[PDB]
Amino acid sequence: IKVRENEPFDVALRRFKRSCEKAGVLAEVRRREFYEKPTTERKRAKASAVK
Amino acid sequence: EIDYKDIATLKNYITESGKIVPSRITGTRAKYQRQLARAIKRARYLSLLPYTDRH
Amino acid sequence: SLSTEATAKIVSEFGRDANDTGSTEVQVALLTAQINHLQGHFAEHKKDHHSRRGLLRMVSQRRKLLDYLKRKDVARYTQLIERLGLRR
Amino acid sequence: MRHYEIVFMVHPDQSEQVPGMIERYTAAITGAEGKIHRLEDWGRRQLAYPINKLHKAHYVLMNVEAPQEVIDELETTFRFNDAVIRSMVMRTKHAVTEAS
Amino acid sequence: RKQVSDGVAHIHASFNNTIVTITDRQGNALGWATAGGSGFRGSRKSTPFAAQVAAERCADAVKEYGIKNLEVMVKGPGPGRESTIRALNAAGFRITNITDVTPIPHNGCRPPKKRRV
RNA sequence: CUUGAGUCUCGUAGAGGGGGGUAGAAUUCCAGGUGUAGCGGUGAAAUGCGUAGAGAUCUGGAGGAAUACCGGUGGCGAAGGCGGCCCCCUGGACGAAGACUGACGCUCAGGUGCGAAAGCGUGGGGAGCAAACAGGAUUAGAUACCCUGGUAGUCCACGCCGUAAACGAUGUCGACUUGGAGGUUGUGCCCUUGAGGCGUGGCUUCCGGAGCUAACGCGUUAAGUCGACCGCCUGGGGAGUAC
Ligand SMILES: [Mg+2]
Ligand SMILES: [Mg+2]
Ligand SMILES: [Mg+2]
Ligand SMILES: [Mg+2]
Ligand SMILES: [Mg+2]
């Protein structure tokens, strides 16, 4: 995620990092993998997404 | 979406990070999404597109 | 599966005449083609079990077509085996 | 006899070979009843990423319809030609011609 | 001592500690600082404030190089991820480019089990 | 005889299988530059790594494993299971204009084959993770949970093992029985001038009616209503143990 904004106005623009990469992708890989836990615990979200 | 050399089209189906955009966001059909993914993937391999931002 | 050409080709040598592909003799012959042609594909690789599953289905099936033919008319049966050299 | 959309990119400082390469590859194909249906020379081009140094390659199209035998022979040469780098090749999908 | 006027600032935003290393656009480190060394430890060195006193401390070590502008290379979660940058710029540093270099494998090595309570 | 079953023609989607290449991200390790006193870890710690210069950062190199995003209520498979891209070899499924065969079908004791992970043999490979093991910690104790390491193994080839909550805890085949919302794929009609709308086959989610059920629930993908064949149960423990 590259950010180079012309005209100095010190505005972080942390939207990119917090739009996909950064946390969420790291916290997801922090501990062990998943194996069987993903095919469920993750798909157990659709049981919620439905309603 | 059907061809890979058509980088001009695939760029629309890719975020700013380089990863292809989800199907729900774009709205595009699933059948088409799959066909797109393949074109995009092989396109990146021919250095016609980026993998991420760094390289 | 089998080439469209090699197919029509065999449909004539055993087919009741032409344009017909239901003839017992035809099927049996057609199967033997892949059955034999596949032996090469299986002679190599071997661990390709999933593909074998299809192979056996052809054999076991041909076994029925042949067995059936024998019941409906021993003649065609005996002759059929000769050209394809089957039944041990 | 099948179709393939072969596309190979050669090292930039080898651009002068690009043409020579094409003639040989093409000849080999047609030589055995080949049948080229698209020959595009994109020449030098910036790379998305520095694929093993240098960010500029020399892409070329082919989309030639010929028996797997020759196209296979050709695939190997690409490996024994330090000049050429990446190389991809897909199947028929009905001869393509023009555009790109 | 060499006068660079513009280099880059790396930030190791680790869930436990945060260290900032100022170096020219080449990679050659000019100076660094770390929350752990900036005083507080453990329960106190892993806070957003930690990186602040650290980053600002990294400047009072390299600013002596005549630096004017400098890009930012942020990698890793935890605090001091953003805190470090602010203090850096707030120090007069003419910021320019802020890019996240956090490592993200397209499914490679197997992460450690760890933590189980 | 043609409606069951099958063959042919042409299309369609797919992480179906076997073989061989190959790409990018990342980890680790080795070498060198910059640089300097911490890093690492936890609830704190400590073990450990650091002035023999770590960590950080940059450059080059070595190697193994897995393929972010796409990705899904998704797809394929007999089941086990199968995700980067490319080629080669190869199996099945579905639709439809039809053409052909003519009951060639369904089920299946024994039999034969396929079988996750772990494990076993021979020879390779070995980055990350990690039984064993060794330290540090916590505790009354801690042969654990946590931290620092780390062997088998995990990876490959070939042979063996044949088990699992091998689970939908629901055998296979076929026919009937209100509806709703959605997914995926084939196909037909419609100014298709459209995103499109309407039909109509395959596979698939959730909801629910009758009915069924001890209840929970199932509910046209039934656990409803029926027919064909098979497997299995007959109180708990002892015991899936002994012989
Ligand atoms: Mg451990
Ligand atoms: Mg095993
Ligand atoms: Mg072994
Ligand atoms: Mg299925
Ligand atoms: Mg229901």
Curated annotation (Swiss-Prot), chain A:
The name this protein goes by in its record: Small ribosomal subunit protein bS21
Binding partners and assembly: Part of the 30S ribosomal subunit. In stalled ribosomes contacts ribosome rescue factor SmrB.
Native species: Escherichia coli (strain K12)
GO terms, biological process: cytoplasmic translation; ribosomal small subunit assembly
Annotated function: Probbly involved in recognition of ribosome rescue factor SmrB in stalled/collided disomes; fusion of protein fragments to its N-terminus decreases ribosome rescue in the presence of SmrB.
Keywords for the protein's UniProt record, in alphabetical order: Ribonucleoprotein, Ribosomal protein, RNA-binding, rRNA-binding
Family membership noted in the UniProt record: Belongs to the bacterial ribosomal protein bS21 family.
Entry annotated with the keyword rRNA-binding: yes
This protein's encoding gene: rpsU
Molecular function as annotated in GO: rRNA binding; structural constituent of ribosome
Residue spans of biased composition, Basic residues class: 43-51
Gene Ontology, cellular component aspect: cytoplasm; cytosol; cytosolic small ribosomal subunit
UniProtKB/Swiss-Prot annotation, chain C:
Domain of life of the native organism: Bacteria
Induction data: Part of the metY operon that extends to pnp, also has its own promoter.
Functional note: One of the primary rRNA binding proteins, it binds directly to 16S rRNA where it helps nucleate assembly of the platform of the 30S subunit by binding and bridging several RNA helices of the 16S rRNA. Binds to its own mRNA, stabilizing it 5-UTR and preventing its translation.
Species per Swiss-Prot/TrEMBL record: Escherichia coli (strain K12)
GO cellular component, one term: cytosolic small ribosomal subunit
Protein name: Small ribosomal subunit protein uS15
Entry keyword RNA-binding: yes
Keyword rRNA-binding: yes
Assembly description: Part of the 30S ribosomal subunit. Forms a bridge to the 50S subunit in the 70S ribosome, contacting the 23S rRNA.
Swiss-Prot/TrEMBL keywords: Ribonucleoprotein, Ribosomal protein, RNA-binding, rRNA-binding, Translation regulation
Family the UniProt entry places it in: Belongs to the universal ribosomal protein uS15 family.
InterPro entries referenced in this protein's UniProt entry, alphabetically: Ribosomal_uS15 (IPR000589), Ribosomal_uS15_bac-type (IPR005290), uS15_NS1_RNA-bd_sf (IPR009068)
Curated annotation (Swiss-Prot), chain D:
Keywords per UniProt: Acetylation, Ribonucleoprotein, Ribosomal protein, RNA-binding, rRNA-binding
Chain positions with N6-acetyllysine modification: K93
Record has RNA-binding as a keyword: yes
Single GO MF descriptor: mRNA 5'-UTR binding
GO cellular component, one term: cytoplasm
Any single GO BP term: cytoplasmic translation
Chain segments annotated as transmembrane: none
Modified how: 5 different forms of the protein, varying only in the number of C-terminal glutamate residues, were isolated. The sequence shown is form bS6-6, which is the longest. The first two Glu are encoded by the rpsF gene, the other Glu are added post-translationally by the RimK enzyme.
Keyword flag Cytoplasm: no
Function per UniProt: Binds together with bS18 to 16S ribosomal RNA.
Family, similarity comment: Belongs to the bacterial ribosomal protein bS6 family.
Binding partners and assembly: Part of the 30S ribosomal subunit. Interacts weakly with uL2 in one of the 3.5 A resolved structures.
Protein name: Small ribosomal subunit protein bS6
Classification of source organism: Bacteria, Pseudomonadati, Pseudomonadota, Gammaproteobacteria, Enterobacterales
From Swiss-Prot, chain E:
GO biological process: cytoplasmic translation; translation
Pfam families in alphabetical order: Ribosomal_S11
Misc: Has been predicted to contact the N-terminal domain of IF-3 based on footprint studies; exactly how IF-3 interacts with the 30S subunit is controversial.
PANTHER family: 40S RIBOSOMAL PROTEIN S14/30S RIBOSOMAL PROTEIN S11
Subunit structure, as described in the record: Part of the 30S ribosomal subunit. Interacts with proteins uS7 and bS18. Cross-links to IF-3. In stalled ribosomes contacts ribosome rescue factor SmrB.
Family (UniProt): Belongs to the universal ribosomal protein uS11 family.
Name of the protein this chain belongs to: Small ribosomal subunit protein uS11
